[PDB]
Amino acid sequence: MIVTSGVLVENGKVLLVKHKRLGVYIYPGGHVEHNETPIEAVKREFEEETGIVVEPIGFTYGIIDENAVERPMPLVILEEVVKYPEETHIHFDLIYLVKRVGGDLKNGEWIDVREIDRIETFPNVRKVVSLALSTLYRLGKISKLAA
Amino acid sequence: MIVTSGVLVENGKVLLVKHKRLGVYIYPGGHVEHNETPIEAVKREFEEETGIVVEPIGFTYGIIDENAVERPMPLVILEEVVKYPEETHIHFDLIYLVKRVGGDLKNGEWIDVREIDRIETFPNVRKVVSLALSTLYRLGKISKLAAALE
Ligand SMILES: [Ir+3]
Ligand SMILES: [Ir+3]
Ligand SMILES: [Ir+3]
Ligand SMILES: [Ir+3]
Ligand code: NI
Ligand code: NI
């Protein structure tokens, strides 16, 4: 199942929500519906789950012509295992760095990136925030110290 | 629809197939089915369409543990608008650089990149092949370096 996640980091904090069935903290995200692109899906899910409107950002070579438009590269792509009692699912997760462009927080919690070890999170949440901090730094949206 | 494509370049030539509906030359690829990952889909489509067996290659940070395995980044992701008079298709195309690992050519043509500006290709194929060539040049540098380190 192809899914997508959005990693929003502001002022040393990352916005996480609790997974519906697992009850651990995760990046907002979810399954990419058959009728939407992963980009539309991550924006949709981030807003529905937190009330915050975002835009995926990241690297692109800059291709755009009358026939196609290049979309930003995910921060990372992890093929993840989720084990339910009845069956194990495999999530091909396109994880996108995102930025806030609107909305207002209605659900979710801003977690200090250095205190992530204090809350129960889905596997790799910590490694991924580390990747996000290094990336925001590579874009200069953040100082190396902040990263 | 999410789709995937495989860019295979060997000795200055890129392997292209005629688009199933448009005829124009394009990298092998196709839709990702409900039961598979884009990685599996590109390997399946490439073999079905050309007879060649490939493996996607690309950047990875190297994350792999009991809970997840990182998969290679696509060479580029293009959200394509494919217009037919009947219907327009929106293809979110994960384009992977791939390497040959087996099979045998049964369909498709190895196209000399030096001739591609006079060959009718699907939109953006030429820009994508140029990215593939730069990327392969860099990967070739990294492996020769790893080898020299012996
Ligand atoms: Ir772990
Ligand atoms: Ir023909
Ligand atoms: Ir197709
Ligand atoms: Ir064009
Ligand atoms: Ni699920
Ligand atoms: Ni089609």
Short mmCIF file of all heavy atoms in Angstrom, two decimals, chain B residues 19-21 31 82 84 89 91, ligand 6:
data_model
loop_
_atom_site.label_atom_id
_atom_site.label_comp_id
_atom_site.label_asym_id
_atom_site.label_seq_id
_atom_site.Cartn_x
_atom_site.Cartn_y
_atom_site.Cartn_z
N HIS B 19 5.37 3.54 -27.04
CA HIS B 19 4.29 3.71 -26.09
C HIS B 19 3.13 2.84 -26.58
O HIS B 19 2.87 2.81 -27.78
CB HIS B 19 3.89 5.19 -26.06
CG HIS B 19 2.87 5.50 -25.02
ND1 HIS B 19 1.54 5.17 -25.18
CD2 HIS B 19 2.98 6.06 -23.79
CE1 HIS B 19 0.87 5.52 -24.09
NE2 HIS B 19 1.72 6.07 -23.23
N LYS B 20 2.45 2.12 -25.68
CA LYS B 20 1.36 1.22 -26.10
C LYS B 20 0.23 1.87 -26.89
O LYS B 20 -0.37 1.24 -27.78
CB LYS B 20 0.71 0.52 -24.90
CG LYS B 20 1.53 -0.61 -24.30
CD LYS B 20 0.77 -1.29 -23.16
CE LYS B 20 0.37 -0.31 -22.03
NZ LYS B 20 -0.96 0.36 -22.25
N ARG B 21 -0.09 3.11 -26.57
CA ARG B 21 -1.18 3.78 -27.26
C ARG B 21 -0.77 4.88 -28.18
O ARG B 21 -1.42 5.10 -29.19
CB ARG B 21 -2.17 4.35 -26.25
CG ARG B 21 -2.81 3.29 -25.39
CD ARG B 21 -3.69 3.91 -24.32
NE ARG B 21 -4.17 2.89 -23.40
CZ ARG B 21 -4.80 3.15 -22.26
NH1 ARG B 21 -5.02 4.41 -21.90
NH2 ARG B 21 -5.18 2.15 -21.47
N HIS B 31 1.64 1.31 -14.82
CA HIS B 31 0.93 1.59 -13.58
C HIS B 31 1.42 0.75 -12.42
O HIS B 31 1.81 -0.38 -12.61
CB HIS B 31 -0.58 1.33 -13.79
CG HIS B 31 -1.17 2.05 -14.97
ND1 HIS B 31 -2.47 1.88 -15.38
CD2 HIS B 31 -0.62 2.95 -15.83
CE1 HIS B 31 -2.71 2.64 -16.43
NE2 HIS B 31 -1.60 3.30 -16.73
N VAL B 82 -1.28 13.41 -19.73
CA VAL B 82 -1.31 12.68 -21.01
C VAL B 82 -2.68 12.94 -21.63
O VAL B 82 -3.69 12.40 -21.19
CB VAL B 82 -1.09 11.13 -20.81
CG1 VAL B 82 -0.98 10.45 -22.15
CG2 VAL B 82 0.19 10.87 -19.95
N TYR B 84 -5.51 12.65 -24.36
CA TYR B 84 -6.06 11.91 -25.48
C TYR B 84 -7.36 12.67 -25.74
O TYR B 84 -7.95 13.27 -24.83
CB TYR B 84 -6.38 10.47 -25.10
CG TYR B 84 -5.19 9.63 -24.70
CD1 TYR B 84 -4.83 9.51 -23.37
CD2 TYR B 84 -4.45 8.93 -25.66
CE1 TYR B 84 -3.76 8.70 -22.97
CE2 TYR B 84 -3.36 8.11 -25.27
CZ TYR B 84 -3.03 8.00 -23.93
OH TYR B 84 -2.01 7.18 -23.52
N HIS B 89 -5.18 11.83 -18.90
CA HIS B 89 -4.66 11.01 -17.81
C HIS B 89 -3.62 11.79 -17.03
O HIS B 89 -2.77 12.48 -17.62
CB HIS B 89 -4.01 9.74 -18.37
CG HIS B 89 -5.00 8.74 -18.87
ND1 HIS B 89 -4.63 7.62 -19.58
CD2 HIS B 89 -6.34 8.66 -18.71
CE1 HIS B 89 -5.70 6.89 -19.83
NE2 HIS B 89 -6.75 7.50 -19.31
N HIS B 91 -0.59 11.14 -14.71
CA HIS B 91 0.30 10.08 -14.25
C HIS B 91 1.35 10.67 -13.32
O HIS B 91 2.09 11.54 -13.73
CB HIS B 91 0.98 9.46 -15.46
CG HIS B 91 0.09 8.54 -16.23
ND1 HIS B 91 0.50 7.83 -17.34
CD2 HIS B 91 -1.19 8.17 -16.00
CE1 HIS B 91 -0.49 7.06 -17.76
NE2 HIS B 91 -1.52 7.24 -16.96
NI NI C 6 -2.01 5.25 -20.41
#
